[PDB]
Write a protein that binds this ligand. Structure first.
Ligand SMILES: CCCCCCCC/C=C\CCCCCCCC(=O)OC[C@H](O)CO
Ligand SMILES: CCCCCCCC/C=C\CCCCCCCC(=O)OC[C@H](O)CO
Ligand SMILES: CCCCCCCC/C=C\CCCCCCCC(=O)OC[C@H](O)CO
Ligand SMILES: CCCCCCCC/C=C\CCCCCCCC(=O)OC[C@H](O)CO
Ligand SMILES: *C\C=C(C)/C=C/C=C(C)/C=C/C1=C(C)CCCC1(C)C
Length: 231
């Protein structure tokens, strides 16, 4: 558990995802409105999955060594298993808020799976120059997602209840800003060019992970948008 200088950030991350899961679970009790239940279920699952994968990194299961640049490099592969299942759920929270059509949802979840799966391939690739080829396909998939969130969602939200429009626009903005930092941390951290050491990279991903999952949920689940309009 100790011996790895990043361990303090993995321990903190685990604690914050556990506490976030327990909070949403308790808040979610008794909610009867069928629409709100769907938002509670999706949004509580996100930190529950991330809690289990942070714990696996803490205990050292979610780590493997990958040779490249003539050295053995520690790669936390458990990050991608986490993101494979949590990032489509976050996009589903947004798409259900604006009642997106089924074709649009499919396009978003599919592009997201491509983004995370090519990120994983790049992380495990042993030929140094090819890691950046995968990084660029993965980043291209993420630019399609952000485009849909602005031209495919923002246009629909504005034709809906004001409480829905308002909450979507805050969540959309939060999403665009936090998600776009991820490819940058990868590129300058241990998986890429290696300018930032692993212990600081782990700190940066931990602040982004907690903000984009627990912070995101705090904003959505206090809104009136998730309830049906009723007397
Ligand atoms: C120290 C605490 C550690 C953190 C806890 C360990 C996390 C792993 C455990 C459990 C999964 C529990 C259920 C996760 C799914 C919750 C979904 C939900 O609550 O949905 C409510 C909805 O309203 C219903 O219809
Ligand atoms: C709504 C969707 C909910 C989704 C919830 C699903 C979460 C599944 C989690 C984990 C097991 C996956 C572990 C992958 C198996 C790797 C085992 C292996 O081959 O060796 C690794 C080595 O033991 C160590 O470094
Ligand atoms: C491993 C990576 C892939 C699996 C990870 C799971 C991620 C989330 C699941 C699904 C999106 C598929 C489309 C589901 C959208 C349906 C929402 C909808 O359109 O509404 C239908 C409902 O009938 C109205 O009441
Ligand atoms: C739209 C929101 C998401 C956009 C995300 C796409 C970001 C574009 C990528 C890269 C330029 C930075 C490349 C700089 C890398 C040079 C590293 C180097 O070789 O320098 C060694 C070091 O500086 C000696 O100390
Ligand atoms: C659970 C939290 C969130 C916000 C996860 C998001 C992760 C990404 C947006 C990852 C993107 C990557 C790309 C675009 C290219 C480099 C490799 C990554 C997989 C980190």
């Amino acid at each position: 558990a100790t011996g790895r200088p990043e361990w303090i950030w993995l321990a903190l991350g685990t604690a914050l995802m556990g506490l976030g899961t327990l909070y949403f679970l308790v808040k979610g009790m008794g909610v009867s409105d069928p629409d709100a239940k769907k938002f509670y279920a999706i949004t509580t699952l996100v930190p529950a999955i991330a809690f289990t994968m942070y714990l696996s990194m803490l205990l050292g299961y979610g780590l493997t060594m990958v040779p490249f640049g003539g050295e053995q490099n520690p790669i936390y592969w458990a990050r991608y298993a986490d993101w494979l299942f949590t990032t489509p759920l976050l996009l589903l929270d947004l798409a259900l808020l604006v009642d997106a059509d089924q074709g649009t949802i499919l396009a978003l979840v599919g592009a997201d799976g491509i983004m995370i799966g090519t990120g994983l391939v790049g992380a495990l690739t042993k030929v140094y120059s090819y890691r950046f080829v995968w990084w660029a396909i993965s980043t291209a998939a993420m630019l399609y997602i952000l485009y849909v969130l602005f031209f495919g969602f923002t246009s629909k939200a504005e034709s809906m209840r004001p409480e829905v429009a308002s909450t979507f626009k805050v969540l959309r903005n939060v999403t665009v800003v936090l998600w776009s930092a991820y490819p940058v941390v990868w590129l300058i951290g241990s998986e890429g060019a290696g300018i930032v050491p692993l212990n600081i990279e782990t700190l940066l991903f931990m602040v982004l992970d907690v903000s984009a999952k627990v912070g995101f949920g705090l904003i959505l689940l206090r809104s009136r948008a998730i309830f049906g309009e009723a007397e």
